[PDB]
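DATA SHEET
Item: assembly model
Revision: 1
Owner: S.N.
Input lines:
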Amino acid sequence: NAVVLHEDKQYYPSAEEVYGSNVDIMVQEQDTQ
Amino acid sequence: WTSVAHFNRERIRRGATVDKTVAKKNLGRLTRLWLKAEQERQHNYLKDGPYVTADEAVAIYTTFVHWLESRRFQPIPFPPLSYKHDTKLLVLALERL
Amino acid sequence: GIEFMDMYSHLIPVYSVDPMEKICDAYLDQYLWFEADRRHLFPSWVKP
Amino acid sequence: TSSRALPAHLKLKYRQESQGTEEEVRKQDLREALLRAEAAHFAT
Amino acid sequence: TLLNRLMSLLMDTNLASYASAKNNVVLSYKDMSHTNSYGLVRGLQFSSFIWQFYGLVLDLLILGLQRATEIAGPADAPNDFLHFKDQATETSHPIRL
Amino acid sequence: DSVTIEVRNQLMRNREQSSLLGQESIPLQPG
Amino acid sequence: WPRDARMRLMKHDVNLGRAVFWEIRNRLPRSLTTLEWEDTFPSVYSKD
Amino acid sequence: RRWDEDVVFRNTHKGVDDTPRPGFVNDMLRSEFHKKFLARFVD
Amino acid sequence: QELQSVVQPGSLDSEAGIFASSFDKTGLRLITCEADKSVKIYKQVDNATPETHPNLPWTPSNLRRRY
Amino acid sequence: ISNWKNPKGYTIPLDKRLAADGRGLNDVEINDGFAKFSEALYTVERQARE
């Protein structure tokens, strides 16, 4: 019944929802060296 | 295209460019991207209904009504044909334009 | 019409309206601001 | 002829002793090292 | 729609309806176009007033009716800019200015 | 007709002025 | 400003400022506006 | 408390959080970076 | 074995693709560079047990290849 | 058949140009929540007036 604000909207499932729990999801946006 | 737009806009914001052409190109790209986002936002608004709930709207209307009646606000009327100040308001608007 | 004015740090949206509608809007603006000030709608703390 | 075609970097660099030459890679055991490293990463 | 219902309180139904319908226009840049149905168009000549009384609503939401009445004072005898009628009302609430 | 009833209700709502004016009211027929 | 003229980040003062921001933000419905901490700066005057 | 009991809306931001850090969406027009970029450079 | 690559959440269905790949030095890990802006690592199942993990069935002597 | 340019004259009838778009695939529907929202605004507006 709750409304979804535009900024709160999600179009895609989480990488966990799409790859299972036996895969580690790495998001390396920033450098480490 | 979007990555180049981001990079060029950041460069322009810092101040590292003096091209008129690069500034105009990036202004065009930013306008296109913003308009895409705005069209998506309006479409989402139509899809997802009024973000402000019925209860919130009722509460806001009630508070505004109470506030206006507390200060005895006399609602603005439609300007009659015999309004003394029409010419003056008209000339003021014309000068501002 | 809609276009953006470049300040090199933010973009200002500029709207182009039809001339006759501009005249009507300007007159309504002047009338509404004069009537609101005459009837004390805005309580001192709104700015500018 | 051209400025960029002039001689430059005339000494080719080869991997030294502790830099991972072919001899060491053949001597090293990469498999169990890889599994140990993966387990160490998993522990975090 | 909430804006239209609110604007109907201040002025005549005709003026409120005109001001509400003026904000629902078709914005077009080059070949891109869309219908503005959720936001507020700031390019209108009366958009200043429209925003000023919509933001007096938010002032009422933030302050509350009693604190707003204390700050503004009676409608017939409004307070000064940043002054109160007396120290008793000034110190009666955490919000001073 | 239901449509003409809806026209009837919306025409009366069009005549209904600002709430602060505190003018009269007309209860509307259902259907 | 040169520090010693800025805000001293005492735990009590910082918590008071954040509490004030939290209260004022909760005062407003999220469907029509919101307050961002990146745009807000509550400056506290106290014994510290 | 008697200083906030006049008001009409309470706990409007009760359950909001900061940002979906682990979320990496492969769509440059819907990512957090683009949203922040547009919210910063357009005013 | 037949495997279908699955795209990361933001991509389209048509965005599934593979451009580069390489086994590591040992050969137990396979690195795949996709048309999806993502790099995937593939590892053989450790439990093995050919009884419980059969390959694709092999049907001999159907017919000679056209060639 | 493009809506922007063509190097030669190559007149195209209006029906074919109309057929080249995705307007039909984009639905035009309004949420149900507007019906309850507007009616609530109309209800309170009448209540305060009375």
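QC remark: The beta strands of chain I are 18-23, 29-34, 39-43.
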